[PDB]
Design a protein around this ligand. Sequence first.
Ligand code: BDF
Ligand code: BDF
Ligand code: BDF
Ligand code: BDF
Ligand code: BDF
Ligand code: BDF
Ligand code: NA
Ligand code: NA
Ligand code: NA
Ligand code: ZN
Ligand code: ZN
Ligand code: ZN
Lengths: 89, 89, 89
Amino acid sequence: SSVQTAATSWGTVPSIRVYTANHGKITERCWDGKGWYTGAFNEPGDNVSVTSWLVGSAIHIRVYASTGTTTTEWCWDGNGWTKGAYTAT
Amino acid sequence: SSVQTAATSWGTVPSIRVYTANHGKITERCWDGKGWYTGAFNEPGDNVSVTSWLVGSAIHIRVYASTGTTTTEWCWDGNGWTKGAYTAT
Amino acid sequence: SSVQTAATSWGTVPSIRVYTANHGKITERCWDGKGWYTGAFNEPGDNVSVTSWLVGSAIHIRVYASTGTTTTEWCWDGNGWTKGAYTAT
Ligand SMILES: OC[C@@]1(O)OC[C@@H](O)[C@@H](O)[C@@H]1O
Ligand SMILES: OC[C@@]1(O)OC[C@@H](O)[C@@H](O)[C@@H]1O
Ligand SMILES: OC[C@@]1(O)OC[C@@H](O)[C@@H](O)[C@@H]1O
Ligand SMILES: OC[C@@]1(O)OC[C@@H](O)[C@@H](O)[C@@H]1O
Ligand SMILES: OC[C@@]1(O)OC[C@@H](O)[C@@H](O)[C@@H]1O
Ligand SMILES: OC[C@@]1(O)OC[C@@H](O)[C@@H](O)[C@@H]1O
Ligand code: NA
Ligand code: NA
Ligand code: NA
Ligand SMILES: [Zn+2]
Ligand SMILES: [Zn+2]
Ligand SMILES: [Zn+2]
């Protein structure tokens, strides 16, 4: 079987973020042009998807972590991860 | 276990679309800057991926819904969802 | 049950790439504006995610293929697929 991943990137360097779901936990690895390192994101989930967008040169990331039938949105706007407003119904 | 999602976004507001596969059915939730609401997309699938692109300010979305070994592409060009030309072989 | 896919696109034509994981093998289908055709990517994986970015008009693609707990990054910079530096720890 296997872990499940999601990936996003931005800019021209680029920056890359890769999220991995394994045993109900999602972790994050990061590339900013030099090498890979572990990111701050660490939240529960069996499944993960991600999207991101720039405002000028500032990144915003949304990570959708699902356990069973519950999907939690996690927000990065440049200063820490927080739960977002997403609901499924 | 859990549902499986895919996500896309565009612009700077942004607009966000989150697709969720659960019990062989995919549904869609939408954010356009104000709050989340249910979108028009509703098609069968155990698995889902998505990509989207802008022409100027008009969005185009492609959703790849898979059941067993059959992957159906669904197209949004601004005026309703239709099946696209994608085939796997 | 079902195969698992990931998708990316770029430009305004657009170009689209759709990766499908089935039986521990990932393959690639390609659209460049005319029709769909099979791409060069063919590597092992039970799970797949993808991201891509432009430099001017040149595409770069990163495909994250996972089997069990091992995630291999595959790089397209315009001249063949190679393994990238990604590690999970
Ligand atoms: O600079 C790395 C970092 O701050 O980038 C944005 C997010 O990916 C964070 O989780 C991560 O720690
Ligand atoms: O800044 C956070 C937020 O408003 O960003 C846009 C959407 O992701 C919302 O669900 C989320 O609460
Ligand atoms: O305005 C919402 C909407 O039209 O946006 C484009 C697609 O996401 C549609 O399914 C969705 O109903
Ligand atoms: O406008 C629909 C279409 O031509 O868009 C590009 C690709 O997604 C094709 O498979 C699809 O039929
Ligand atoms: O022109 C098609 C192609 O070269 O595009 C870039 C990558 O998707 C390759 O695997 C693919 O064969
Ligand atoms: O050109 C290849 C490379 O440097 O591209 C950026 C990242 O994907 C790295 O892991 C990878 O080795
Ligand atoms: Na250090
Ligand atoms: Na209303
Ligand atoms: Na031919
Ligand atoms: Zn284990
Ligand atoms: Zn159930
Ligand atoms: Zn089979």
